[PDB]
Amino acid sequence: KNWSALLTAVVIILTIAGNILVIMAVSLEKKLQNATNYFLMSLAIADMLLGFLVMPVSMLTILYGYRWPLPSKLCAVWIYLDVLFSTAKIWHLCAISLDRYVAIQNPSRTKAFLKIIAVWTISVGISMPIPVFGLQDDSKVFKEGSCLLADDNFVLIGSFVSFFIPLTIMVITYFLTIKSLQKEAADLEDNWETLNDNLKVIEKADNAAQVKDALTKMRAAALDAGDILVGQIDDALKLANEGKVKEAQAAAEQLKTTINAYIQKYGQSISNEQKACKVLGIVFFLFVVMWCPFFITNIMAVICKESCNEDVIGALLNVFVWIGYLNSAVNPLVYTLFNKTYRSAFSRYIQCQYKE
Numbered sequence: 001k002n003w004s005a006l007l008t009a010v011v012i013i014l015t016i017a018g019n020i021l022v023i024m025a026v027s028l029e030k031k032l033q034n035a036t037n038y039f040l041m042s043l044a045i046a047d048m049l050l051g052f053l054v055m056p057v058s059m060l061t062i063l064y065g066y067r068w069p070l071p072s073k074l075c076a077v078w079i080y081l082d083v084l085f086s087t088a089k090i091w092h093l094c095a096i097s098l099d100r101y102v103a104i105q106n107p108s109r110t111k112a113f114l115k116i117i118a119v120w121t122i123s124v125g126i127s128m129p130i131p132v133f134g135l136q137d138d139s140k141v142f143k144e145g146s147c148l149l150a151d152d153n154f155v156l157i158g159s160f161v162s163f164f165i166p167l168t169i170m171v172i173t174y175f176l177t178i179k180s181l182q183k184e185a186a187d188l189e190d191n192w193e194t195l196n197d198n199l200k201v202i203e204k205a206d207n208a209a210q211v212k213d214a215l216t217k218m219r220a221a222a223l224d225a226g227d228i229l230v231g232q233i234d235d236a237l238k239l240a241n242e243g244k245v246k247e248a249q250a251a252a253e254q255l256k257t258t259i260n261a262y263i264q265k266y267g268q269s270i271s272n273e274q275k276a277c278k279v280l281g282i283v284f285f286l287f288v289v290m291w292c293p294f295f296i297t298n299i300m301a302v303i304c305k306e307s308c309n310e311d312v313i314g315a316l317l318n319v320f321v322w323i324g325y326l327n328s329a330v331n332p333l334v335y336t337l338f339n340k341t342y343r344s345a346f347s348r349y350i351q352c353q354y355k356e
């Protein structure tokens with residue numbers, strides 16, 4: 001009741017401060033100058049604004065027993081901001097998972113800021129009926145002196161249009177990305193074993209036919225994995241045509257170092273992408289799980305409208321909205337625990353020390 005807004009002041013400060021640090025890490029540290037971190041910044045701005053504009057007023061309403069204390073046309077604006085920032089979070093998370101998947105089937109700041117503005121303009125688009133209709137008709141934004149989204153059509157259609165189509169895409173594109181990266185690793189182990197098999201074949205060889213056939217199959221396996229090494233095989237395949245067998249065999253042991261080079265490089269690469277898919281999936285998992293109680297309970301407010309205790313349902317909505325607000329505090333901590341780049345960045349900003 002009266003004591004309950006002491007907890008909420010904590011959740012505001014950790015939100016504001018963590019997300020400021022995320023915006024500072026992406027603005028300053030050059031190891032974060034990529035499209036994914038550009039989305040993560042935009043998300044942190046949404047998280048910061050939710051902490052500044054929405055969350056203190058929600059705390060304020062807890063102090064006035066949910067009876068709305070500000071001007072009456074401020075109610076529909078507060079619900080607009082609340083839905084706007086949460087809608088922008090889900091559409092960001094979806095835009096990350098989609099963009100990161102599309103990139104794995106492919107070979108600029110401007111390209112990222114264009115996508116972000118698209119996410120924000122859709123979020124402003126979908127949230128827009130709330131003040132347009134709500135400022136016109138208080139029956140849509142007030143229930144018994146309390147400022148809450150009252151129109152059940154807005155809750156249902158918004159819950160599915162503005163949160164189930166992005167979630168569907170986010171969950172599908174995440175799972176296909178795991179499978180995409182799993183095939184890439186499978187396909188590189190296969191290319192390692194056939195290169196290594198033909199390395200052992202060239203070294204055992206007695207004649208020009210065995211080397212020429214084995215280097216032809218090394219070049220084929222080279223075309224699958226890729227540039228640099230392919231010509232070096234051709235540098236040795238022309239030796240094997242002339243009959244220069246000892247001469248081709250010594251070139252192939254020189255190919256060995258160039259093969260081991262591209263293997264560890266493409267091998268780190270997929271480990272790092274699967275490290276990153278692991279972090280983003282915790283961000284994704286937490287957003288849904290923490291907002292899941294509020295989402296289900298608010299839809300059940302609408303279904304059993306008369307059948308259920310409106311007072312109990314509403315006393316759970318007021319608890320379950322802070323589990324989702326707490327999700328504004330988590331994304332920064334996730335980055336601290338699972339990225340050296342953010343953890344180092346944050347650790348120096350805490351000592352008021354900004355130069356990379």
Ligand SMILES: O=C1CCc2ccc(OCCCCN3CCN(c4cccc(Cl)c4Cl)CC3)cc2N1
Pocket residue numbers: 079082083086087090147148149163167287288291292294295317318321324
């Ligand atoms: O399972 C899933 C699927 C993925 C997903 C995405 C988003 C999500 O939640 C965001 C919805 C909150 C937006 N605001 C919250 C605050 N709310 C409000 C306004 C006035 C008074 C009061 Cl009391 C309240 Cl609560 C208005 C609407 C849940 C899920 N869950």
Ligand SMILES: CC(C)CCC[C@@H](C)[C@H]1CC[C@H]2[C@@H]3CC=C4C[C@@H](O)CC[C@]4(C)[C@H]3CC[C@]12C
Pocket residue numbers: 023027045049
């Ligand atoms: C809902 C409305 C009224 C809230 C006001 C929006 C304000 C707080 C937002 C929207 C535009 C934002 C800025 C847009 C661009 C940049 C450049 C980037 O490199 C660092 C953050 C910074 C500087 C943002 C900080 C926060 C910001 C100023």
Ligand SMILES: CC(C)CCC[C@@H](C)[C@H]1CC[C@H]2[C@@H]3CC=C4C[C@@H](O)CC[C@]4(C)[C@H]3CC[C@]12C
Pocket residue numbers: 293296297300304307308309312313316
């Ligand atoms: C006391 C008399 C009038 C009957 C009232 C029944 C009410 C209190 C029941 C029926 C519907 C129930 C809700 C239905 C769905 C959910 C979502 C889930 O996360 C569990 C809690 C929650 C939010 C339930 C809490 C209890 C609930 C609100």
Ligand SMILES: CCCCCCCC/C=C\CCCCCCCC(=O)OC[C@H](O)CO
Pocket residue numbers: 083126127128129130133153154155156157158159162298
């Ligand atoms: C006479 C007045 C008629 C008024 C009725 C017709 C208005 C038509 C407009 C848009 C359809 C509904 C828009 C739904 C999207 C906005 C609401 C929203 O996004 O709510 C999500 C919320 O977070 C969930 O908890």
Ligand SMILES: [Mg+2]
Pocket residue numbers: 193194197
């Ligand atoms: Mg083999």
